[PDB]
Amino acid sequence: MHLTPEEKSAVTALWGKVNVDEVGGEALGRLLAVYPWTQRFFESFGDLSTPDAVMGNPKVKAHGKKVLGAFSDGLAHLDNLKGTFATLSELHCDKLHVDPENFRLLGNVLVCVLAHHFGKEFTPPVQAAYQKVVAGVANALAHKYH
Amino acid sequence: MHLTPEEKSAVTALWGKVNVDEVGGEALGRLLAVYPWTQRFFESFGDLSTPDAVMGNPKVKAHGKKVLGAFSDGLAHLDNLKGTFATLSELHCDKLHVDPENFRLLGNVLVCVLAHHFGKEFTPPVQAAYQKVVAGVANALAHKYH
Amino acid sequence: VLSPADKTNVKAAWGKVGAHAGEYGAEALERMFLSFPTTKTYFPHFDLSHGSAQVKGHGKKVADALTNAVAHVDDMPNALSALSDLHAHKLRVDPVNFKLLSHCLLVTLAAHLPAEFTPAVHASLDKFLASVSTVLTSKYR
Amino acid sequence: VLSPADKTNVKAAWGKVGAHAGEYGAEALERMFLSFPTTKTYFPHFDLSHGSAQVKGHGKKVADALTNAVAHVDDMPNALSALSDLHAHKLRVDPVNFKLLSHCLLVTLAAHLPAEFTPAVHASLDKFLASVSTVLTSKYR
Numbered sequence: 001m002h003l004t005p006e007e008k009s010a011v012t013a014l015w016g017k018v019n020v021d022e023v024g025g026e027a028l029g030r031l032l033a034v035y036p037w038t039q040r041f042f043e044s045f046g047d048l049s050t051p052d053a054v055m056g057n058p059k060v061k062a063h064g065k066k067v068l069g070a071f072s073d074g075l076a077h078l079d080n081l082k083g084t085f086a087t088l089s090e091l092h093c094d095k096l097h098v099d100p101e102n103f104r105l106l107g108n109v110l111v112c113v114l115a116h117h118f119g120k121e122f123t124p125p126v127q128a129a130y131q132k133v134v135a136g137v138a139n140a141l142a143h144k145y146h
Numbered sequence: 147m148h149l150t151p152e153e154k155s156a157v158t159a160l161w162g163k164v165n166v167d168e169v170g171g172e173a174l175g176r177l178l179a180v181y182p183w184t185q186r187f188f189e190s191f192g193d194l195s196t197p198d199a200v201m202g203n204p205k206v207k208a209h210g211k212k213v214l215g216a217f218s219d220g221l222a223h224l225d226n227l228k229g230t231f232a233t234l235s236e237l238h239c240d241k242l243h244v245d246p247e248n249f250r251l252l253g254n255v256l257v258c259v260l261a262h263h264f265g266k267e268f269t270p271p272v273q274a275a276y277q278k279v280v281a282g283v284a285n286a287l288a289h290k291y292h
Numbered sequence: 293v294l295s296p297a298d299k300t301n302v303k304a305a306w307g308k309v310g311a312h313a314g315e316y317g318a319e320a321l322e323r324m325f326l327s328f329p330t331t332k333t334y335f336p337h338f339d340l341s342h343g344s345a346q347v348k349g350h351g352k353k354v355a356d357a358l359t360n361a362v363a364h365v366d367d368m369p370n371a372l373s374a375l376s377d378l379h380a381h382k383l384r385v386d387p388v389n390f391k392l393l394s395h396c397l398l399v400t401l402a403a404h405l406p407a408e409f410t411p412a413v414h415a416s417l418d419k420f421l422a423s424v425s426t427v428l429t430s431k432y433r
Numbered sequence: 434v435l436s437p438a439d440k441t442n443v444k445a446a447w448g449k450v451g452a453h454a455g456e457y458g459a460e461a462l463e464r465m466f467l468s469f470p471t472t473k474t475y476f477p478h479f480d481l482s483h484g485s486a487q488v489k490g491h492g493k494k495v496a497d498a499l500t501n502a503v504a505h506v507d508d509m510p511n512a513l514s515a516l517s518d519l520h521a522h523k524l525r526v527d528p529v530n531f532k533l534l535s536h537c538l539l540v541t542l543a544a545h546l547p548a549e550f551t552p553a554v555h556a557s558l559d560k561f562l563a564s565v566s567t568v569l570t571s572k573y574r
């Protein structure tokens with residue numbers, strides 16, 4: 001993760017101010033509505049036919065928080081995302097059979113959401129740093145595939 | 147570059163059979179013929195109008211061999227690709243302004259060419275090692291881009 | 293393949309961009325050059341420093357094009373045909389970079405239009421811009 | 434789009450595959466799972482061992498569908514429709530994976546057809562498969 005102490009900082013300073021409950025839910029919600037092929041992994045969540053449904057589903061709202069929470073531990077382990085995510089890689093690969101390409105979709109939606117919450121504060125330089133951050137994370141979530 | 151030693155063998159062992167003069171020419175030629183947008187880069191090579199025109203242009207064959215000779219350097223250093231190629235990385239970015247994706251296409255066309263010459267010898271497992279090496283090289287050519 | 297609900301959301305969202313097409317256009321390119329620096333290779337003759345007159349300048353051109361796209365939403369392939377001939381025969385831009393601009397558009401629209409950026413509209417624009425891109429990289433070979 | 438010469442090159446090359454198309458389908462998938470392991474995520478119910486019979490069986494279902502595309506080279510969007518539904522609604526396969534299948538198909542077509550795999554034909558196949566992959570991916574949203 002070639003992150004500059006200034007990038008490392010930019011990320012960090014802005015996460016601090018994140019409401020994890022809201023963001024996490026929204027990322028996942030948007031993920032499932034914009035790119036509806038991801039719905040395949042979550043048939044047991046119930047009605048996931050429309051945006052209003054996808055966005056109102058409480059299993060989605062709850063899984064979202066968990067996802068972002070694991071995203072949070074990662075920011076505190078920016079110099080070893082791989083070790084931090086090994087076990088998650090295996091699960092997603094060996095038990096869940098999820099194509100890693102979804103990870104990228106999640107990171108990109110994830111970045112969209114943040115610019116939606118912070119508006120002016122989510123500047124080009126801030127985004128740039130987060131784009132490296134989400135890409136380090138997807139690559140780490142997909143590091144132990146086989 | 148997770149290269150296991152079998153992978154190293156398969157790779158090294160096979161490359162010892164390549165007439166680089168010829169394969170580099172075939173690869174570059176095919177790159178330019180199957181994806182003629184790449185041509186934007188070699189207006190100084192004369193006639194590129196048609197397959198035959200491309201495949202037989204001597205500035206192409208001469209350029210093909212220059213490229214491949216650099217690929218070979220790389221296979222002699224699969225543990226410091228980023229180091230091997232840093233000056234060729236800067237060149238392609240700061241002076242020729244070449245999008246790195248083109249590195250990926252070249253890589254794949256080269257895999258195609260290798261296959262064409264060696265037929266059954268390009269076994270599934272062998273290709274697989276190759277896909278990694280060309281990926282490695284493409285990342286190494288991409289690294290100093292800024 | 294855009295549905296009518298899709299087409300309707302787009303028209304709306306863009307409509308609120310109204311007169312900031314350009315500011316947005318420029319912002320987007322700036323966001324792109326910065327987050328995906330490899331896209332700079334298509335603009336070696338541009339002064340890419342922040343707030344440059346060329347980027348803006350170029351911001352508009354891009355935006356006016358999207359506005360024409362929206363207005364000819366049911367018939368893009370004809371309305372952008374020249375642009376296609378341009379991006380394929382002259383500029384020869386690698387089709388991947390299209391996804392990168394699109395993402396930088398969405399991110400800009402998202403940061404400027406809080407209220408209009410619903411998940412339904414988000415999903416619409418996403419299909420909208422990808423539809424522009426297919427059309428823009430269709431005359432390639 | 435496919436030009437006359439393209440359809441011509443495609444038919445000639447596919448015609449040489451003839452009977453061996455089923456075994457090429459399988460060599461194709463096999464090359465895919467070995468070189469791009471993420472693709473397997475879609476086949477957790479198959480046995481993916483060298484020689485697997487579930488893989489040969491599927492290999493043939495895949496070639497049979499490329500053959501029928503050649504056969505209806507001029508009406509591919511309606512000829513491949515069912516398959517276009519299956520991949521989008523039921524299987525739900527991320528479009529990037531198709532470019533990897535296609536690439537392994539060329540490697541396969543190239544290791545068995547030395548006489549026939551010229552630059553022009555190599556250019557006609559790449560175009561065909563991209564066109565096959567577009568149809569199969571056409572109804573995602």
Ligand code: HEM
Pocket residue numbers: 038041042066067068070071088092096098102103104106107137141
């Ligand atoms: C930001 C990247 C992602 C992270 C950090 C992440 C993380 C997690 C975590 C921590 C769990 C909890 C399981 C446990 O505690 O044992 C989980 C479950 C899961 N993840 Fe992800 N995930 C990510 C992206 C994806 C996306 C892109 C997909 C594909 C749509 C996906 C599919 C799943 C599924 C199906 C489960 C289990 C759901 C269940 O138990 O009902 N993940 N993930």
Ligand code: HEM
Pocket residue numbers: 184187188190212213214216217234237238242244248249252283287
């Ligand atoms: C294996 C990947 C590649 C390698 C190892 C490679 C290597 C080289 C080398 C060694 C040179 C000569 C350096 C010099 O003149 O000082 C060169 C020149 C050049 N390369 Fe690459 N190259 C690769 C891929 C590409 C591709 C994909 C493109 C774009 C289509 C490209 C574009 C160029 C151009 C435009 C020149 C200068 C042409 C001229 O001499 O007039 N390279 N490359």
Ligand code: HEM
Pocket residue numbers: 331334335353354357358375378379383385389390391393394424425428
């Ligand atoms: C969202 C789809 C895109 C649209 C609608 C678009 C629009 C335009 C327009 C309207 C022009 C002006 C042509 C004229 O002179 O009238 C242009 C030129 C140009 N575009 Fe695109 N663009 C898009 C994506 C991209 C991509 C992804 C790139 C590459 C990164 C790109 C690179 C360029 C370049 C290098 C020029 C030449 C401008 C100059 O030198 O002044 N565009 N584009």
Ligand code: HEM
Pocket residue numbers: 472475476494495498499516519520524526530531532534565566569
């Ligand atoms: C040229 C591209 C492709 C063609 C022509 C093709 C064709 C087919 C065909 C003919 C079937 C059998 C349908 C039936 O059950 O009646 C099928 C099923 C299937 N394909 Fe594809 N396919 C292509 C690419 C892909 C790739 C990229 C993936 C993802 C890696 C994929 C994964 C699958 C899966 C998982 C099934 C279901 C198999 C089963 O459960 O038995 N295909 N496809």
